Scaffold this active site. Structure first.
Site, PDB file in Angstrom:
ATOM      1  N   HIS C  29      37.104  44.868  45.474  1.00  0.00           N
ATOM      2  CA  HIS C  29      36.354  45.983  46.037  1.00  0.00           C
ATOM      3  C   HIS C  29      37.217  46.960  46.824  1.00  0.00           C
ATOM      4  O   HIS C  29      36.718  48.023  47.209  1.00  0.00           O
ATOM      5  CB  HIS C  29      35.230  45.463  46.937  1.00  0.00           C
ATOM      6  CG  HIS C  29      35.700  44.968  48.268  1.00  0.00           C
ATOM      7  ND1 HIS C  29      36.390  43.786  48.421  1.00  0.00           N
ATOM      8  CD2 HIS C  29      35.569  45.491  49.510  1.00  0.00           C
ATOM      9  CE1 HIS C  29      36.671  43.604  49.699  1.00  0.00           C
ATOM     10  NE2 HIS C  29      36.182  44.624  50.381  1.00  0.00           N
ATOM     11  N   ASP C  51      34.911  38.783  42.793  1.00  0.00           N
ATOM     12  CA  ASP C  51      35.566  39.952  43.387  1.00  0.00           C
ATOM     13  C   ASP C  51      37.075  39.763  43.523  1.00  0.00           C
ATOM     14  O   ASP C  51      37.672  40.120  44.540  1.00  0.00           O
ATOM     15  CB  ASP C  51      34.944  40.310  44.741  1.00  0.00           C
ATOM     16  CG  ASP C  51      33.438  40.137  44.759  1.00  0.00           C
ATOM     17  OD1 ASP C  51      32.725  41.162  44.810  1.00  0.00           O
ATOM     18  OD2 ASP C  51      32.961  38.983  44.737  1.00  0.00           O
ATOM     19  N   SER C 103      40.420  43.676  55.922  1.00  0.00           N
ATOM     20  CA  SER C 103      40.209  42.633  54.932  1.00  0.00           C
ATOM     21  C   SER C 103      41.525  42.242  54.262  1.00  0.00           C
ATOM     22  O   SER C 103      42.521  42.971  54.308  1.00  0.00           O
ATOM     23  CB  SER C 103      39.203  43.093  53.878  1.00  0.00           C
ATOM     24  OG  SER C 103      39.718  44.174  53.123  1.00  0.00           O
TER      25      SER C 103
END
Lengths: 48, 47, 151
Positions: C29, C51, C103
């Site tokens: 993402h 993902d 992240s």
């Protein structure tokens, strides 16, 4: 002539037998491929 | 002429379905670090 | 230090990529490109179920790879911004530590081994829960708590 005409369904018995054999063969291979996909898709969903 | 075309379409579809199942089946094993694909999956199924 | 590479887009830092074992992994993402000129040339595979995107590590970078395990006993673990406690199947971070845009950071064991990558988390009063991607013998699995949001 002293008789009526024929229709599309009025074919010999030998011709009918050949038609059934060819159609059945192709139909079988489609069914087998479908069954493989269903098991794989269900297991992957449930395994998660 | 028409019957031949339709029968050809039916066979080609069966091949496409097998390819789709294979890719989704095996994919998990290619992401895990150090993983090895079991013998049965490597050679015989989802090859 | 060396195992972490920056992911940038139009001059802004969006996230990180991590080089672990024999594979390079990056969350799906996150937008942007890889800062390392050599890694930017690799082809990657995508999977929307976890993902994840991954590729094979080129030979000349193999010496930088970190070690990893699969054993996960109850106890305490360390990360870049402090301590994390793992108990009950959830990773607990004190509230307020961590913000969007951070992240892709690995979590390390007591000996410095890689055990998980965090991709988002949930918001709760005294303590927060994380959404993590972890693994087991021969499989990969994803854990997402109720109410988690992407970071």
């Amino acid at each position: 002539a002293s008789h009526t005409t024929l229709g599309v369904q009025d074919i010999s018995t030998t011709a009918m037998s050949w038609v059934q054999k060819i159609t059945g063969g192709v139909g079988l291979i489609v069914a087998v491929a479908a069954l493989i996909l269903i098991v794989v898709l269900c297991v992957s969903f449930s395994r998660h | 002429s028409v019957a031949s075309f339709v029968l050809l379409s039916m066979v080609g579809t069966a091949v496409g379905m097998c390819v789709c199942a294979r890719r989704r089946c095996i994919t998990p094993y290619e992401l895990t670090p150090g993983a090895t694909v079991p013998f049965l999956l490597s050679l015989l199924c989802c090859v | 230090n060396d195992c972490i590479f920056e992911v940038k887009h139009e001059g802004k830092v969006m996230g990180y990529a991590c080089l672990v074992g024999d594979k390079v992994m990056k969350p799906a993402h996150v937008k942007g490109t890889i800062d390392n000129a050599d890694l930017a040339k690799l082809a990657f595979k995508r999977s929307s179920k976890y993902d994840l995107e991954c590729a094979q590590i080129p030979v000349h970078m193999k010496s930088d790879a970190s070690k990893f395990t699969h054993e996960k006993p109850e106890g305490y673990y360390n990360w870049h911004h402090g301590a994390v406690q793992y108990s009950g199947g959830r990773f607990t971070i004190p509230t307020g530590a961590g913000k969007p845009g951070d992240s892709g950071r690995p979590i390390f064991d007591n000996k410095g081994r890689v055990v998980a990558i965090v991709l988002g988390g949930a918001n709760e009063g005294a303590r927060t829960a994380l959404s993590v991607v972890t693994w087991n013998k021969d499989i990969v699995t994803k854990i997402t708590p109720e109410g988690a949001e992407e970071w």
